[PDB]
Amino acid sequence: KAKVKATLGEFDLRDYRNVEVLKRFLSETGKILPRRRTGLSAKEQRILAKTIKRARILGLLPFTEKLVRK
Amino acid sequence: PITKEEKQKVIQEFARFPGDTGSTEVQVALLTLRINRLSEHLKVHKKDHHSHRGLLMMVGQRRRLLRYLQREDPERYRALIEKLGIR
Amino acid sequence: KRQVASGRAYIHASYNNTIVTITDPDGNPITWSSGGVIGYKGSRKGTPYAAQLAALDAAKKAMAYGMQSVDVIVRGTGAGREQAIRALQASGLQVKSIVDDTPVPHNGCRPKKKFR
Amino acid sequence: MRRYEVNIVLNPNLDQSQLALEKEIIQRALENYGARVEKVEELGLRRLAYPIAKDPQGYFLWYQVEMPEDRVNDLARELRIRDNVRRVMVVKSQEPFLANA
RNA sequence: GUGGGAGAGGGUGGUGGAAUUCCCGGAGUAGCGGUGAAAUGCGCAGAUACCGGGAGGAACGCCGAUGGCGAAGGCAGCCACCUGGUCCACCCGUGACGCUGAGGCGCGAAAGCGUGGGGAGCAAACCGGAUUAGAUACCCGGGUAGUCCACGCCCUAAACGAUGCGCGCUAGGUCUCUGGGUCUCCUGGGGGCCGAAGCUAACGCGUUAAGCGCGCCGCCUGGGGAGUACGGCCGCAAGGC
Numbered sequence A: 001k002a003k004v005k006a007t008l009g010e011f012d013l014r015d016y017r018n019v020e021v022l023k024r025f026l027s028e029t030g031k032i033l034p035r036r037r038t039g040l041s042a043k044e045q046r047i048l049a050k051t052i053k054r055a056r057i058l059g060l061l062p063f064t065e066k067l068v069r070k
Numbered sequence B: 001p002i003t004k005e006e007k008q009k010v011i012q013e014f015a016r017f018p019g020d021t022g023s024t025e026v027q028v029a030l031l032t033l034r035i036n037r038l039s040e041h042l043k044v045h046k047k048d049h050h051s052h053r054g055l056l057m058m059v060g061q062r063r064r065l066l067r068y069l070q071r072e073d074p075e076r077y078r079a080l081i082e083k084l085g086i087r
Numbered sequence C: 001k002r003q004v005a006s007g008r009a010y011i012h013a014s015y016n017n018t019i020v021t022i023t024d025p026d027g028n029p030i031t032w033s034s035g036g037v038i039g040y041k042g043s044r045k046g047t048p049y050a051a052q053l054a055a056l057d058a059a060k061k062a063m064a065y066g067m068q069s070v071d072v073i074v075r076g077t078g079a080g081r082e083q084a085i086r087a088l089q090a091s092g093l094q095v096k097s098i099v100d101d102t103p104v105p106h107n108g109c110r111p112k113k114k115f116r
Numbered sequence D: 001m002r003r004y005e006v007n008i009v010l011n012p013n014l015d016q017s018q019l020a021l022e023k024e025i026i027q028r029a030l031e032n033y034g035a036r037v038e039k040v041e042e043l044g045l046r047r048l049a050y051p052i053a054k055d056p057q058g059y060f061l062w063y064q065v066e067m068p069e070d071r072v073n074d075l076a077r078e079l080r081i082r083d084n085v086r087r088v089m090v091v092k093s094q095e096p097f098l099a100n101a
Numbered sequence E: 001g002u003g004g005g006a007g008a009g010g011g012u013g014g015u016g017g018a019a020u021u022c023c024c025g026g027a028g029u030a031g032c033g034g035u036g037a038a039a040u041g042c043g044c045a046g047a048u049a050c051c052g053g054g055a056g057g058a059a060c061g062c063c064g065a066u067g068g069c070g071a072a073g074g075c076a077g078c079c080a081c082c083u084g085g086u087c088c089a090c091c092c093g094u095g096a097c098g099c100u101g102a103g104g105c106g107c108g109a110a111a112g113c114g115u116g117g118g119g120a121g122c123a124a125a126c127c128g129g130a131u132u133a134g135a136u137a138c139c140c141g142g143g144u145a146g147u148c149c150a151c152g153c154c155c156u157a158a159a160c161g162a163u164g165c166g167c168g169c170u171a172g173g174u175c176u177c178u179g180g181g182u183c184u185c186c187u188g189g190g191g192g193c194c195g196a197a198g199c200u201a202a203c204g205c206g207u208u209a210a211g212c213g214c215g216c217c218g219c220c221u222g223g224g225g226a227g228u229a230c231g232g233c234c235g236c237a238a239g240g241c
């Protein structure tokens, strides 16, 4: 495996309107990924959170999805 | 809020001489500005306790600067007081 | 006699029982089955075997009802939540996509003292 | 005054009578509440994650503004009363915090 | 003072999704539920499982941490506004303005009281089913206060770091949050863990002291009787000091 930010360009961590990127921070289901897999740091992750939830309200990133296989 | 304009107008108003930021007179006036603000906050918003505690501490501060002035210049303290509405 | 071809199957599973419900591609049910459906009575109901039998029964049912290819959705947890899945697999219905839908909430309701 | 970003998501099934009309009443609420406009971007028709007002998609708008702070909440009262607009989100701007930088 | 910074610190309006319940509709039978097993209970007036729509209340998954903020109690969706505290850098301003703080005054989980709302889930009392020699309990099915909101009381607690506040001093190593740096590292400021010297009856503590000191407040003087009695104050009461 590898972290998220390990492949990514310089990008606004506060910009909600950009889905293409934020998407890379969710799981197979809606759940925001943990530090371990997002390779961020405190202030980082903590920002990403609010960024994301802001986008969820604007109906871009999902509050949840379903899980294939199982 | 309060902006650097509101600040400066006050400071420059109470300056003992040009440039003084920290003298007693100035700190007391500045204080008093922020005091009277918080008064109007807790005029509505009475359910806000923690801001209130902050304002207690604030008045205890200005009172202590005044006790300093009075034991030091009786006059400057009188002028300060009458100028600001206090007592 | 709706003669329904390809369709969807809900497997609900709790620790106390299992229930399959076969339904049409937009969600209105067709047949259903459970541990009580087939002969089982008590605790015996939430065994995996009964889950096997349940699935199979609802499979035979839906097939004589004209079913062929099935998309499964699973809600819940308990023994033979998986056996119903292994059952539907080998049933003769064809398994399209198994999904897991188990609803979890965002903390709304204060759970029963048994569950806290 | 301060600087805000107003998001609007409204129903995709409109035509140009209706599009004109809603955009104008947006203008009206800004003029009335005193919000000068820095930029605007119309993102347009985009596929949401979850249905809003039973609708599988949405029509998106973004207005960077400045305005008197204390009326921003009433500004949103008005923008929300509008029936064909199903989300309003107004937020004060932030400096562009970066990462991987 | 100026310039930056972090935060579930507080208050007010607003709004977003998951879930539970409930009502409307569709489709569909004979059970569902629940337990060690069971029964009560609900279901042919059609439940359960499924799909669409509506109403309402409460709480905010993932992020979330061995994390943060707060004087304490305590604080967690998102937005906005009103506001408190705190930290770093600059070394600019006042020039001892300091520390502590008997009494007073205000805040103070939960439960509890009052008047008025509200009610989804939960749930003392209660009503039933069981289990046991018996069940006044654990387990099950219902359920009222209450839990939520507004205003006013109550003022307790393992209100716990069982460690009162302030300052100076006394090896390090390591993990972490948040500032500033010429950013392998250095430097403030919080949070943990090992451990110098030292301390301790031991356990342990050890620059977040329980070490070495100074100031100030609180408090202790065998166990039971007893946080009882009496008196006083406070409280609508419950009861508190």
Ligand SMILES: [Mg+2]
Pocket (backbone or CB within 6 Å): C015, C016, C017, C042, C043, C044, C045, C046
């Ligand atoms: Mg059972």
Ligand SMILES: [Mg+2]
Pocket (backbone or CB within 6 Å): D080, D081, D082, D083, D084, D085, D086
């Ligand atoms: Mg609308």
Ligand SMILES: [Mg+2]
Pocket (backbone or CB within 6 Å): none
């Ligand atoms: Mg400042």
Ligand SMILES: [Mg+2]
Pocket (backbone or CB within 6 Å): E008
């Ligand atoms: Mg907060």
Ligand SMILES: [Mg+2]
Pocket (backbone or CB within 6 Å): none
């Ligand atoms: Mg708040």
Ligand SMILES: [Mg+2]
Pocket (backbone or CB within 6 Å): none
């Ligand atoms: Mg709902």
Ligand SMILES: [Mg+2]
Pocket (backbone or CB within 6 Å): none
């Ligand atoms: Mg019905």
Ligand SMILES: [Mg+2]
Pocket (backbone or CB within 6 Å): none
């Ligand atoms: Mg009956």
Ligand SMILES: [Mg+2]
Pocket (backbone or CB within 6 Å): none
């Ligand atoms: Mg009957």
Ligand SMILES: [Mg+2]
Pocket (backbone or CB within 6 Å): none
């Ligand atoms: Mg529904």
Ligand SMILES: [Mg+2]
Pocket (backbone or CB within 6 Å): E056
């Ligand atoms: Mg109701």
Ligand SMILES: [Mg+2]
Pocket (backbone or CB within 6 Å): E064
């Ligand atoms: Mg967690």
Ligand SMILES: [Mg+2]
Pocket (backbone or CB within 6 Å): none
């Ligand atoms: Mg605590």
Ligand SMILES: [Mg+2]
Pocket (backbone or CB within 6 Å): none
């Ligand atoms: Mg602030």
Ligand SMILES: [Mg+2]
Pocket (backbone or CB within 6 Å): E091
């Ligand atoms: Mg100097």
Ligand SMILES: [Mg+2]
Pocket (backbone or CB within 6 Å): none
């Ligand atoms: Mg001098």
